[PDB]
Structure formats: structure tokens, C-alpha cells
Amino acid sequence: IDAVDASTVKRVANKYIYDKDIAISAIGPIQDLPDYNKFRRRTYWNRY
């Protein structure tokens, strides 16, 4: 646990989160929930 520093978190997040496919499971009143494509775009920041 102590070996997980700020640079380690960023490396792992880039391996697993950055521009990665996601799975979505929703139930109930979910018409206002954004579509898969919106959620997929929000996996990366184009300003960097």
C-alpha cells in the first residue's frame, strides 16, 4: 500500500481508465442518464 504514490495512481489510471470502454447497468427512471457515447467521451480530457 505504501508503494502506491501519486505517480503510481496516474500510471494505473492511464492503464485502466483513460480512453477505455465501459459497462453500464441502469434501472428505474433513466431517460436523463447520458448515452454510452457521452460516457465514453468523458473517459479522457481533450484539453491535455
Binding site: 492511464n14 483513460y18 480512453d19 480530457w45 481533450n46 484539453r47 491535455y48
Partner: protein, 57 residues
């Protein structure tokens, strides 16, 4: 190889530069290739192909 490749899909600033460079080189190559085919299809009809070019009298 991998150095530029990993920078292009990871940083939008690098990707934007890649788009700008591709537009610069891609358009120049097309312009060069179009002109070469234009010259090949028009042999002997150019301004510098005139035989009497330079002797008006």
C-alpha cells in the same frame, strides 16, 4: 515508433500537431502528384515548349 505513437493517442496537444502536420504534408503530396499527372497528359502544349519562344521578329 512507440514514443510518438503513445504520445499521439494520449495527449490531444500532440494529436492536434499530428493533424496539422498531416494536412501540411498530405496536401503538398497531392498537389505534387496532381501536377505530375497534369504535365504528363499535356506534353508539348506548355508555354516553354514553344519552338519560336524568344524570336518575335
Amino acid at each position: 515508433f512507440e514514443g510518438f505513437y503513445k504520445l499521439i493517442m494520449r495527449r490531444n496537444s500532440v494529436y492536434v500537431t499530428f493533424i496539422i502536420a498531416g494536412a501540411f504534408f498530405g496536401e503538398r503530396a497531392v498537389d505534387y502528384g496532381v501536377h505530375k499527372l497534369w504535365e504528363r497528359n499535356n506534353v508539348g502544349k506548355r508555354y516553354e515548349d514553344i519552338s519560336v519562344l524568344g524570336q518575335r521578329p
